[PDB]
Each structure stands twice: as structure tokens, then as C-alpha cells.
Amino acid sequence: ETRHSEIIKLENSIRELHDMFMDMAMLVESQGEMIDRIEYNVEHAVDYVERAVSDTKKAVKYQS
Amino acid sequence: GIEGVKGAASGVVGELARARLALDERGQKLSDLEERTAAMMSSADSFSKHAHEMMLKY
Amino acid sequence: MASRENEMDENLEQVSGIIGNLRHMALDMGNEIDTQNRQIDRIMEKADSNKTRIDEANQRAT
Amino acid sequence: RRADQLADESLESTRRMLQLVEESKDAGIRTLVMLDEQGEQLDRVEEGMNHINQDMKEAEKNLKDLGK
């Protein structure tokens, strides 16, 4: 009964380890969706600022 | 061994728990960053509209 | 000696080996998350600074 | 007898362990691939922040050339 009980103690530890790895993968995937949205906002912000620089440059041309 | 393997598993659980705690912080920081970049984007959008209107007057 | 005791032992050796790999992964995960957390802090400060700078130019233009 | 029922339960435990660590290995590898890709996204995001800051210097100069 002894080796059986110790093997079971080991399985319990390995299940804890496994479940933490599974959780880590899920959380990283979810957070990746947020990073996708941050990156989208940043790309559009960059574009708006580039357009603004270009338009103020043109206004100077059209003075001038 | 069984004790040696159990020890190695415990060891990994501890190291991974530290990484999990750091991943929780990253999530909190990312939620904050999403708000900050959404606000930065809105400002950029408005500035672009006004620069465009300005250009079209001359 | 026996196929049951033999599979048990082989299973435990394979498990032991894989755990060593799992340990290496947990190290790399911790290192990558720590570096990214520091980078996110920098990005956040830059986001707000940018927003301020945009808002102030936008008032000259409104 | 009871010893056979227990030796069988122990064997099956080691099989479950092997499955658990193999699944853990697959999850760990996918996690590291995601963290790497997400890391390159953050590099692009930071690049964007820096580009905005530099563009704003040019915008400010232009507004000053407009008398604003």
C-alpha cells in the first residue's frame, strides 16, 4: 500500500503543476487579445499624428 | 526515487507561481495601458481634424 | 522484473525528464514577463506624455 | 490480490502523470511562442510612441511657422 500512496502523492503534485501551466497558457492568450487592441489604437494614433504633421506642413506651404 | 521527482515537481510549481504573479501584474498593466492608449488616440484624432481644417483655409 | 513494474519505472523516468524541461520553460517565462512588465511601464509614461503634447498643440490649432 | 489491484492503480497513476506533463509541455511551448509574438507587438507599440513624440516636434515647429 506504501508505494501506491507515495505514487498518488506524486500525481497530486503533477496535477497542480499541469493546471498552473494550463492557466498560464489561457491568461497569456487573453492578454494577447488586449495587446492586439493596444497595437490597433497605437497604429491609428500614429497615422493621425502623421496626417497632422503633413497638414500643418501644407498650411505653411500654402501661406506664401 | 519517487521523493526526488516529487521534489522536482514542487520546485517547478514554486518557480512557475512566481511567473504567474508577474503575469497577473502584466494583465493589470495592460488594462491600464489600453485605457491610456485609447485616450491618446482620441486626442490624436481631434488634433488631426483640426490640422486638416487649418490646411484647407489656405 | 515484470512488464508492470517496468512500465511504471519507464513512465517515471520519462516524467522526471519532462519536468526538467518544464523547469527551463518556467524560467524563460519569468524572464520574458519581467522584461515586458518594465517595457509596459515605459510605454505607459510615453502614452501620457504624448497625449499631453498632442492636447497642447491642439489648443494652438483650435 | 489486493497487491495486484494496487500495483494496477499505481501503474495507471504513472500513465496519467505522463499525460499530464506532456500536455504541460505543449502548453508551455505555446505560451512561450505567444509571449515572443506579444513581445514583438510591444516593441512595435513602443516604436509608435517614439514616432508620435518625434512627429509632434515637427508639428510644433509648423504651428510656430504659422504664427500660432
Curated annotation (Swiss-Prot), chain A:
GO cellular component: acrosomal vesicle; actomyosin; axon; endomembrane system; glutamatergic synapse; membrane; neuron projection; nuclear membrane
Free-text tissue specificity from the UniProt record: Expressed predominantly in cerebral cortex, hippocampus, cerebellum, adrenal medulla and retina with weak expression detected in non-neuronal tissues.
Segments forming domain t-SNARE coiled-coil homology: 1-59
Principal localisation: membrane
Keywords: Cell membrane, Coiled coil, Cytoplasmic vesicle, Exocytosis, Isopeptide bond, Membrane, Neurotransmitter transport, Phosphoprotein, Synapse, Synaptosome, Transmembrane, Transmembrane helix, Transport, Ubl conjugation
Molecular function in Gene Ontology: ATP-dependent protein binding; calcium channel inhibitor activity; calcium-dependent protein binding; chloride channel inhibitor activity; identical protein binding; kinase binding; myosin binding; myosin head/neck binding
Domain of life: Eukaryota
Biological process annotations from GO: calcium-ion regulated exocytosis; exocytosis; hormone secretion; insulin secretion; intracellular protein transport; modulation of excitatory postsynaptic potential; neurotransmitter transport; positive regulation of calcium ion-dependent exocytosis
Residues with site note ((Microbial infection) Cleavage): K58, A59
Compartmental location: Cytoplasmic vesicle, Secretory vesicle, Synaptic vesicle membrane; Cell membrane; Synapse, Synaptosome
Cross-link (Glycyl lysine isopeptide (Lys-Gly) (interchain with G-Cter in SUMO)), chain numbering: K57, K58, K61
Modification after translation, per record: Phosphorylated by CK2.
Assigned protein family: Belongs to the syntaxin family.
Protein's recorded name: Syntaxin-1A
Taxonomic source organism: Rattus norvegicus
Lineage per the UniProt record: Eukaryota, Metazoa, Chordata, Craniata, Vertebrata
Swiss-Prot record, chain B:
Coiled-coil zones: none
Residue list for modification Phosphoserine: S46
Tissue: Isoform 1 is detected in heart, brain, lung, liver, skeletal muscle, kidney and testis. Isoform 2 is detected in brain and in testis. Isoform 3 is detected in testis.
Cellular compartments annotated: Cytoplasm; Cell membrane; Cytoplasmic vesicle membrane; Synapse
All residue ranges annotated as the v-SNARE coiled-coil homology domain in the record: 1-58
PTM: Phosphorylation by PKA reduces interaction with STX1A and enhances synaptic neurotransmitter release.
Role of this protein: Inhibits translocation of GLUT4 from intracellular vesicles to the plasma membrane. Plays a regulatory role in calcium-dependent exocytosis and neurotransmitter release. Inhibits membrane fusion between transport vesicles and the plasma membrane. May modulate the assembly of trans-SNARE complexes between transport vesicles and the plasma membrane. Competes with STXBP1 for STX1 binding.
Family indicated by similarity: Belongs to the WD repeat L(2)GL family.
Subunit structure of this chain's protein: Part of a complex that contains STXBP5, STX4A and SNAP23. Interacts with STX1A and STX4A via its v-SNARE homology domain. Part of a complex that contains STX1, STXBP5, SNAP25 and SYT1.
Official protein name in the record: Syntaxin-binding protein 5
Annotated organism of origin: Rattus norvegicus
Whole sequence portion shown: 1087 to 1144 of 1152
Swiss-Prot record, chain C:
Residues carrying the site annotation (Microbial infection) Cleavage: R42, I43, Q59, R60
PTM notes: Palmitoylated. (Microbial infection) Targeted and hydrolyzed by C.botulinum neurotoxin type A (BoNT/A, botA) which hydrolyzes the 197-Gln-|-Arg-198 bond and inhibits neurotransmitter release.
Subcellular location: Cytoplasm, Perinuclear region; Cell membrane; Synapse, Synaptosome; Photoreceptor inner segment
Disulfide bond positions: none
Phosphoserine modification, residue list: S16, S49
Stated family: Belongs to the SNAP-25 family.
Role according to the record: t-SNARE involved in the molecular regulation of neurotransmitter release. May play an important role in the synaptic function of specific neuronal systems. Associates with proteins involved in vesicle docking and membrane fusion. Regulates plasma membrane recycling through its interaction with CENPF. Modulates the gating characteristics of the delayed rectifier voltage-dependent potassium channel KCNB1 in pancreatic beta cells.
Name of protein: Synaptosomal-associated protein 25
Positions spanned in the full protein: 142 to 200 of 206
